[PDB]
Design a protein around this ligand. Sequence first.
Ligand SMILES: Nc1n[nH]c(N)c1/N=N\c1ccc(O)cc1
Length: 293
Amino acid sequence: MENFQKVEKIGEGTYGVVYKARNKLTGEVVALKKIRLGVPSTAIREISLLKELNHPNIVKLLDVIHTENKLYLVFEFLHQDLKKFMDASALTGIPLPLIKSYLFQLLQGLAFCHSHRVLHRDLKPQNLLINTEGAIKLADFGLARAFGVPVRTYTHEVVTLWYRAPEILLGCKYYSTAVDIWSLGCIFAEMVTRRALFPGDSEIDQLFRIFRTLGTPDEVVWPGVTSMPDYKPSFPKWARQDFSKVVPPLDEDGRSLLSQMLHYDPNKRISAKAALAHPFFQDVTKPVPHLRL
Ligand SMILES: Nc1n[nH]c(N)c1/N=N\c1ccc(O)cc1
């Protein structure tokens, strides 16, 4: 604050408004997130850890400014998010090579964060940001654990459930890096089909949409599921569909990979590091998007 000229709003994440801003010294143009709330010290301490978790696929946290009831996070500015790009690209879709490049890069971002035991917990197309040179980067990494995840944002807009892993929906309190692999799998499926995979509009709806596509989980596919807090014996028991029906026209390597990322059992679900070795990525390249900013 003080030091920043606000130039436009670009965002209203769960925790507060994001503005494009110019630093009145450095020249530099940044995204300034003004987080509403003085400030609880554990979150300060947590957020500050984030200043060292740097990777070319993680949106750089430039500075943390704590002043009153006032927490501003100053990030690297990128000029659009994947949801806007997807919307823009709807008539033809994102070309597969670009989809592949984006998935590859996000997995790298995740492998990095995961290797330092940092989870995102709330990946969604809105927090995947892209630039003109064919990069894509994860934003808001680590903010969920620092703060919480609320059911509504500061604006009352509802927090999307569409990318939530089933172990979170079933009440697992101590979930793992696997939850980000689930989310990125849903996002990969959405890029390919141009439709969200599981667009739930409540927690039961989200879970039943998952069950309807992947089969109601049981003790066979997921040891320990029926003991989870929010598991009920009364869930309907739906059959698994083929992936071939779910993500046409993804090829067999794509489908193989997606299936591994969407394993019910978080223990069996593919890691980011293992995903990077999958044959899907054998012919990966780094195309430039056509970007109309
Ligand atoms: N549109 C954008 N360009 N660059 C950004 N960083 C950006 N938007 N949003 C965010 C959102 C959250 C964040 O932690 C960082 C940036």
